[PDB]
Amino acid sequence: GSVVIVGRIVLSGKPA
Amino acid sequence: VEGEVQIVSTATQTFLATCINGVCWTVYHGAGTRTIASPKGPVIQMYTNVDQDLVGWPAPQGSRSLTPCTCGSSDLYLVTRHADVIPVRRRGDSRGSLLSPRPISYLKGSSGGPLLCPAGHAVGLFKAAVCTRGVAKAVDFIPVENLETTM
Ligand SMILES: [Zn+2]
């Protein structure tokens, strides 16, 4: 089985 | 918007990975020898160092690399899978003590996460919590110097 990415963290808090 | 830290997940576990110098690094005791998923099929690890509990894949899409710390500071900050920030005074090469101890549950699932110096630069990867009776007071971390040599 593979490691899957379920979310991301942006250290600077930069908004989309 | 790109993130430096990815919340990664196995069938049995969940933990963090941190991108540094273009590699997505995380703890071997979580990933094992697993490939990481991509929209073009599995990608195999670039580095595997079981001695140091360290593995790396190529950094995925949506990611952005952290810069290695070079200011030697001893005032660290651990970022958890909940994006909580925790001040950690550095004791040795791979050891740091929480300025304010937290329940063990508060750090659960964060190994692989970054340890930041005052400049937001990577000092090491969170390796494991050091606990007295369910209360984490210190942490072990893979110093980023190990990452740089492992490359
Ligand atoms: Zn620094």
In units of Å, what resolution does this entry have? 2.5
Active site residues of B: 29, 53, 109, 111
Q: What is the CATH number of the domain that holds B105?
A: 2.40.10.10
How far is residue B3's CA from residue B56's CA, in Å, rounded to a whole number? 17
Please indicate, yes or no, whether residues B44 and B80 belong to a single structural domain of this protein. Answer: no
Q: What is the CATH number of the domain that holds B62?
A: 2.40.10.120
How far is residue B56's CA from residue B35's CA, in Å, rounded to a whole number? 10
Instruction: State the CB neighbour count (10 A cutoff) for residue B100.
Output: 8
First to last CA, chain A: 32
Q: A9 with B79: CB under 8 angstroms?
A: yes
Please indicate, yes or no, whether residues B48 and B88 belong to a single structural domain of this protein. Answer: no
Amino acid at B19: C
Closest CA to B119 of B144, B136, B142: B144
Closest CA to B66 of B107, B103, B17, B101: B17
C-alpha separations of B131 from A7, B24, B105 in Å: 27, 27, 11
Q: B136 with B130: CB under 8 angstroms?
A: yes
Q: Give the containing element (helix H, strand E) for B18.
A: strand B14-20
How far is residue B22's CA from residue B93's CA, in Å, rounded to a whole number? 23
How far is residue B6's CA from residue B23's CA, in Å, rounded to a whole number? 12
Please indicate, yes or no, whether residues B86 and B139 belong to a single structural domain of this protein. Answer: yes
B69 is in an annotated binding site: yes
How far is residue B137's CA from residue B112's CA, in Å, rounded to a whole number? 18
How far is residue B144's CA from residue B20's CA, in Å, rounded to a whole number? 9
Q: B115 with B77: CB under 8 angstroms?
A: yes
Nearest to B36 among A3, A10, A16 (CB): A3
Please indicate, yes or no, whether residues B17 and B62 belong to a single structural domain of this protein. Answer: yes
Chosen domain end from B13, B44, B66 = B66
Q: How many CB pairs under 8 A join A and B?
A: 69
Domain count, chain B: 2
Closest CA to B26 of B62, B52, B64: B52
Residue B33 sits in which domain range?
A: 1-66
